[PDB]
Design a protein around this ligand. Structure first.
Ligand SMILES: Nc1ncnc2c1ncn2[C@@H]1O[C@H](COP(=O)(O)OP(=O)(O)O)[C@@H](O)[C@H]1O
Ligand SMILES: Nc1ncnc2c1ncn2[C@@H]1O[C@H](COP(=O)(O)OP(=O)(O)O)[C@@H](O)[C@H]1O
Ligand SMILES: Nc1ncnc2c1ncn2[C@@H]1O[C@H](COP(=O)(O)OP(=O)(O)O)[C@@H](O)[C@H]1O
Ligand code: BEF
Ligand code: BEF
Ligand code: BEF
Ligand SMILES: [Mg+2]
Ligand SMILES: [Mg+2]
Ligand SMILES: [Zn+2]
Ligand SMILES: [Zn+2]
Ligand SMILES: [Zn+2]
Ligand SMILES: [Zn+2]
Lengths: 246, 358, 334, 368, 360
């Protein structure tokens, strides 16, 4: 017995990209039960996948070419992990079935079934900063290498880096409970006021890993608001990192 | 989307809270004056409003119309907090999550800036149920939290909390709601919900609930569930298993004269009617108290029970006050011991027969 | 479990509220052992998880009905202590709480049954508080207990308390006579010892415990005329100290009633023993003995890991000491 | 504006600020002046007496850039990042997260490292009694001799739970609970410094309400300020605490002693309309009764407060023999214990008072 | 301006500088001089008695260019490298740190390898009683046949938890807790050498408060100097010991027995200033009364737990009739029963002591 509220006929590589964009920013056994999963949203010809845990947000909004009614459901962490475990990089036309309570996927010769979390996912639109005035655009690989270099001495129990933004140079500074300092400098093109902003280097590195592009743009508002990260030449997926207190 | 009386009538503004004015005034003035603590512990018995007041404080603190003592209730933050879907309001049950890894989860979660609201609010229920490990590891985060983190605590009994935990939080003691306040709240709720009610039934429900509005609303819901959805005196009496003053007065006069036959036969008949032994002892103590009242002052006598005052005055006249006090103490001890007896009827029989041998 | 005839009207008084859509999500049933509260909880759960009810009753072979009969309904919840223990821990209710967050597998209701709320650890109760107060949509709870007062105050504050009134004494006697065949005095003794619970009377009769009651009666027939209550040790110390102590305390209560002459007593099967107890014992001594027996039964029921044999031996020695003239007897106080 | 909480804003930052604890203050100042700085300290006291604050002050004094001064001297960089909560030399460690030896060993293998821009690496192991015996004996060696740059500051509430071996290798300093006068003095300092009007009676009531700590006094003072509108009054403080007007309870105990029923009834049914919880009425009466009992013991036990009714305290002490006071106190205590099982709280209080009246040692109720 | 801690600055360096434990020192000297040293020496004493000091001195005697002897030399290479804590093959292990059988096995894999310096590879394990049973068995197995230049030194505060089989492998020494005289004399010598003004009564108070441990005496001396600006007078030590006083229950019993109301009030107010829980105070008062009754029944009822205040307890048992003890015990029992429902328990305990004083 099944009433398909929302039916997708979508390439399996497309949803592979969608989930891989937002899989890492997910809550594991969090107190907020509605966050222990991932939001599937449907808006016209656009499919959106949102995932957050209170410190990260990852939204991937991709057109599919087929128009569907707007909808929003939450699939638990186990279901999406199982889907990724089963999803491959082929050409089989995947078929998503969205009902009132369950998620189903016909994938070539396999069927994936799961329940849905009974809750309302938070509105991601207000999480995104509303004044993305400052822009840091730099090569993705250079940023990844610099962050990994600064995170070499960072501990698992203390993982966090401070970004000093200046006229051109971007400084990444990392400390540790052992009280030893690491510093990296980059020639990112920028124009704005000097600022200091602290984030967990693991989350930023995961965001960069999710972006397989030549360069990225970070949108910044002030020292206490969240930072957005996006492809400098595409708007298919955006990421939000909440700053840490210093 | 049907909701039972309690949750369907959860207070949504400071003007909708019954009683608790001594904490509501301080809360509203703290919101308005800009003096806001980082840790509030609302402590009281069941069904007095600790969770409701905590949620109202959470709504007011992070309303995007500014920190206000009167939340709009239509804004994004207010609706999300009311529905419980707000990320910056983390509702934790201490018993469910009392572990070292959960404490570390709280400690590393409080370090990140709030996602949506002004402040990251932690509402922990039954806080006294944490482990000593959790209490001691959470001392600093309640003493000097970050600028954007505020804690709300709610325990049924502060005595089981560590005293160092109590020292570093704002103590809001919620008094048990008065009978008149409870009855007026039932009247308002039933009028707003178009449910027929009788003042005697409301009085019985208010007295039955021991100063707790959630208990009053549960008993109310029971009253609607029995007797075609009407709060009537007969239905409430049948539900509570209460009895009028005649039976209890007959029992007391039989017991005071040491009439074993009459006392035992009356207890047998009472068991046959399926009455409440706890209610029977409650009426016992009430009638003994009124006997002592008449003994103290002749005018200190009830007016509703004018039909039975004839034997009432005679019994109050013929019995010394000390014997009445002894009977009252024995019946009170029996009521206290009643839950632990092999049977409720057996325990009340023990109490009454002990009272007989005086 | 089994269904009982007198048990129907209460079920009809609850399932009607549930069909009206105005039923409480948390119903706490107060009923003595053998009353049949499990029957109500199971029947109501079957009705709730049934897709298309037929006159407020489970409708034969429904998909929900089929999965209920198979006992593997995904949306059905049972909370009982592990058979090697007598308490319900934090994790048992925690898995229920965390796995209740998801939608109903079959798209219907989500029904949870706690087998005995008294066995719940206070931590488990506090964990279940949040789910009882504000359950998700189409979620229903069922709790059972011998006495709601023993439960946590805030636990029972969130539930509507239903009461299972024991059937009339004559009706219960008729049912017992229909099931078991013996003298009416034995039936009355079983009923009044079971606090009016006829299921407990069936449990007493079917097992050997009634024969142990007879053994205790014989040991008392020798015990009271000679002041040799210690010999009752073997009659009481067989993994049933609450039941044997309850019978002994009820015999003392019946003797006390025989003092303040009463038309009805519990132990009607042994009037001679009651007369001997009344004649050979001072009323104040009877008070002290009954109180001490009740206190020791309470201590045996409450404390876990306690030695039954030592407690019963101390009880008997204290009774022997009370028998001597000039002893100060205890009185309940404070 | 923001008005940072009194405890957070008005936390002491100098040995000229800490009220009370004269022994530990003198010890720290004199030892720092003489340069005899022990490597292990044990501040032991009840909650909110100043162990953490005094420890931070000592850490400030040790690592002032100007030099080794008794008090934290001219607050330089190190001192001001210390007072901001930022690390210069303060490794603040909760013992609840490092009870296991597997983490104490990790703590110990990091101690042998020079501090950054500081003269010491000051370890603040709070609630130190929560460690495990294995952890105690593991850090035993480091306690007996740490590196020159490592200092140990241990703060705990119950030193009895500590093993005697670690207790040996620590300077023990016990912090007595602050007297009510010192608490009231500090609260008056705070309210004068915050431009908030205050009443002496309200401050006295708040100081009594705090059980010898200034943290509870400050939380109560914040609650009282919230109850008002930026001021504290006797009305506001009394409503916050729930304590009734001593005249009422004192008239009630007088009427109980004098064995008149009508006055008792008038007092109780007037107190019913004042919105005072009945159990606190019984508690206040019992407190008064024990106060007269203590007055009987000694004139030393009157109280600096209760002056408005002290003459009547003394008169009741003179009139009533100790046996009657014991009888009344026992009756009221039993009544308060029995109160939860009474039909009503007012019913229970009334019956308890009437029972004290009926069993009056001198003028019992007339009997038929 | 060193002003170092007097505890370790005054640790013994030669066996002649150790206070007490004379029989142990004689036995070690006899073993070092004429006999063959046993393959394992275990030490058991109290806190701050000298155990680790004696073990370190014995290790210094083992490894030295002068040879294996009792008083080897001064300022030699090995003796200095031990005194500075920088010695290589003088392994120092905390048993609690290495209770795991795997860590113990890794430790016992090092015995085969030859010492880097000196003659003997000395292992010094502290609080050896806390080793796991498997680790203890492995230690015994490596102790039955140790290498010819590998020796073990073990210390523990409570040897009662050690299995009896440890006696089959190692020679044990028990160090007696120092009396008041030895501790007082050693403190007097330390103060005289450090040029610290002092009074004999202050030294006696420090020694009595030490309760047998010299490390406790040194710590209290450091606190007394810190508070008294070097001037260690009787009044200073008395006041700072009163700040640390916790015998409140015993003093309360003594004063309540003596019907001293003002003394009981002062002591109960001091206990309130101490922030002591009242229920615990009352239950330990009950325990003290019960112990007095038992030691009245038989002198052997006392043990070493109350060997700090045994004199006053013996006097109380001698002077107080058992009927008074029973009455006081009943009064305190009913006071504890009624304490929770009383007002603020600071005054409930007071009034229970009042009722006790009423029996005069
Ligand atoms: N002061 C109050 N005003 C109005 N309703 C109340 C009040 N206190 C309790 N209630 C009722 O009780 C229900 C539960 O209240 P809650 O605030 O959770 O009590 P608690 O303090 O025990 O958590 C509410 O849904 C509301 O119906
Ligand atoms: N001696 C004191 N002088 C001044 N304020 C104090 C004192 N002791 C405690 N306080 C108050 O208590 C607050 C916290 O004190 P704290 O030192 O943390 O006590 P604790 O010893 O329990 O950690 C301080 O901010 C201060 O207002
Ligand atoms: N017999 C002693 N002679 C000299 N100093 C001693 C003696 N006993 C203890 N001490 C002092 O106490 C400090 C610690 O002694 P230690 O031998 O470690 O005690 P423990 O028996 O508890 O391990 C030593 O540095 C020394 O100053
Ligand atoms: F039911 Be409440 F939270 F005490
Ligand atoms: F550190 Be204290 F006990 F608040
Ligand atoms: F080092 Be000891 F055993 F205190
Ligand atoms: Mg709540
Ligand atoms: Mg040692
Ligand atoms: Zn709003
Ligand atoms: Zn069906
Ligand atoms: Zn400085
Ligand atoms: Zn040498």
């Amino acid at each position: 017995d099944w009433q398909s509220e929302v039916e997708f006929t979508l390439p399996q590589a497309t949803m592979k990209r969608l989930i891989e964009a937002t899989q890492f920013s997910m809550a594991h056994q969090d107190v907020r039960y509605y966050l222990n999963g991932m939001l599937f949203e449907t808006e016209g010809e656009e499919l959106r996948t949102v995932a957050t845990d209170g410190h990260r947000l990852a939204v991937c909004s991709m057109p599919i070419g087929q128009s569907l009614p707007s909808h929003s459901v939450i699939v638990p962490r186990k279901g999406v992990i199982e889907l990724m475990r089963m999803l491959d990089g082929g050409d089989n036309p995947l078929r998503v079935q969205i009902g009132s309570n369950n998620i189903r996927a016909h994938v070539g010769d396999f069927i994936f079934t799961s329940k849905l979390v009974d809750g309302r996912f938070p509105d991601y639109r207000r999480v995104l900063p509303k004044n993305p005035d400052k822009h840091l655009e730099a090569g993705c690989d250079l940023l990844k290498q610099a962050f990994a270099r600064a995170a070499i001495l960072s501990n698992e129990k203390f993982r966090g880096v401070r970004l000093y933004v200046s006229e051109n140079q971007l400084k990444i500074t990392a400390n540790n409970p052992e009280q030893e300092e690491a510093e990296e400098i980059l020639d990112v093109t920028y124009s704005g006021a000097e600022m200091e902003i602290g984030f967990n280097v693991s989350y930023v590195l995961d965001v960069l890993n999710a972006l397989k592009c030549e360069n990225v743009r970070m949108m910044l508002t002030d020292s206490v608001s969240s930072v957005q990260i996006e492809d400098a030449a595409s708007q298919s997926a955006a990421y939000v990192v909440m700053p840490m207190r210093l | 989307s049907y909701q039972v009386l309690a949750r369907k009538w959860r207070p949504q503004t400071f003007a909708d809270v019954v009683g608790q004015e001594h904490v509501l005034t301080a809360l509203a003035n703290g919101l308005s004056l800009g003096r806001i603590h980082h840790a509030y512990l609302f402590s009281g018995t069941r069904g007095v409003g600790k969770t409701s007041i905590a949620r109202l404080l959470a709504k007011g603190l992070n309303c995007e119309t500014g920190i206000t003592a009167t939340p709009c209730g239509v804004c994004d933050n207010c609706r999300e907090i009311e529905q419980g879907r707000f990320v910056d309001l983390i509702e934790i049950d201490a018993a469910s999550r009392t572990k070292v890894e959960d404490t570390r989860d709280l400690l590393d979660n409080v370090q990140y800036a709030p996602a949506r609201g002004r402040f990251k609010v932690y509402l922990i229920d039954e806080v006294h149920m944490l482990s000593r490990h959790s209490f001691n590891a959470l001392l600093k985060t309640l003493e000097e939290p970050p600028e954007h983190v505020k804690f709300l605590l709610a325990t049924t009994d502060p005595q089981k909390l560590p005293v160092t935990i109590l020292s570093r939080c704002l103590q809001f003691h919620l008094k048990a709601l008065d009978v008149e306040q409870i009855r007026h709240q039932l009247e308002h709720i039933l009028n707003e919900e178009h449910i027929a009610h009788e003042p005697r039934a409301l009085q019985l429900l208010a007295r039955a609930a021991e100063g707790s509005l959630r208990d009053a609303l549960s008993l109310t819901d029971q009253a609607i569930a029995s007797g075609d959805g009407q709060v009537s005196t007969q239905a409430v009496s049948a539900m509570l298993g209460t009895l009028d003053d005649d039976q209890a007065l007959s029992l007391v006069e039989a017991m005071v004269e040491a009439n074993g036959e009459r006392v035992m036969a009356l207890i047998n008949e009472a068991a046959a009617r399926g009455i409440e032994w706890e209610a029977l002892l409650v009426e016992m103590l009430g009638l003994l108290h009124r006997i002592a009242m008449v003994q103290l002052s002749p005018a200190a006598l009830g007016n509703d029970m004018a039909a039975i005052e004839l034997r009432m005055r005679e019994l109050a006249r013929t019995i010394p006050p000390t014997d009445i006090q002894l009977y009252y103490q024995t019946l009170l001890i029996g009521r206290k011991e009643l839950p632990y007896a092999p049977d409720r009827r057996m325990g009340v029989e023990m109490t009454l027969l002990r009272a007989l041998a005086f | 479990m089994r269904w009982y005839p007198w048990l129907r009207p209460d079920f009809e008084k609850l399932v009607a509220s549930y069909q009206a859509g105005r039923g409480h999500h948390a119903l706490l049933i107060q009923a003595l052992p053998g009353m049949g509260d499990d029957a109500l909880i199971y029947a109501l759960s079957r009705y709730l998880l049934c897709q298309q009810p037929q006159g407020h009753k489970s409708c034969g072979h429904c998909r929900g009905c089929q999965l209920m009969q198979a006992g593997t309904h995904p949306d059905y919840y049972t909370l009982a202590p592990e058979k090697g223990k007598n308490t319900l821990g934090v994790d048992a209710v925690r898995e229920v709480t965390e796995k209740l967050n998801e939608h109903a597998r079959l798209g219907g209701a989500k029904v949870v049954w706690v087998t005995d709320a008294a066995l719940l650890t206070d931590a488990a109760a506090n964990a279940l508080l949040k789910t009882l107060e504000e359950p998700p949509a189409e979620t229903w709870f069922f709790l059972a207990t011998r006495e709601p007062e023993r439960l946590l105050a805030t636990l029972r504050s969130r539930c509507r308390l239903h009461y299972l009134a024991p059937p009339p004494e004559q009706y219960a006697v008729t049912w017992l006579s229909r099931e078991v065949t013996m003298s009416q005095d034995a039936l009355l003794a079983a009923l009044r010892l079971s606090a009016g619970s006829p299921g407990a009377a069936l449990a007493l009769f079917q097992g050997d415990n009634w024969q142990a009651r007879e053994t205790l009666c014989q040991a008392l027939a020798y015990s009271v005329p000679s002041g040799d209550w210690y010999s009752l040790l073997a009659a009481l110390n067989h993994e049933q100290a609450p039941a044997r102590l309850h019978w002994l305390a009820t015999l003392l209560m019946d003797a006390l009633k025989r003092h303040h002459g009463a038309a009805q007593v519990t132990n009607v099967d042994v009037p001679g023993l009651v007369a001997e107890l009344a004649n050979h014992l001072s009323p104040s001594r009877l008070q002290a003995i009954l109180g001490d027996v009740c206190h020791i039964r309470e201590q045996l029921m409450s404390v876990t890991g306690i030695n039954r044999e030592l407690l019963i031996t101390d009880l008997l020695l204290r009774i022997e000491h009370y028998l001597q003239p000039g002893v100060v007897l205890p009185v309940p106080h404070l």
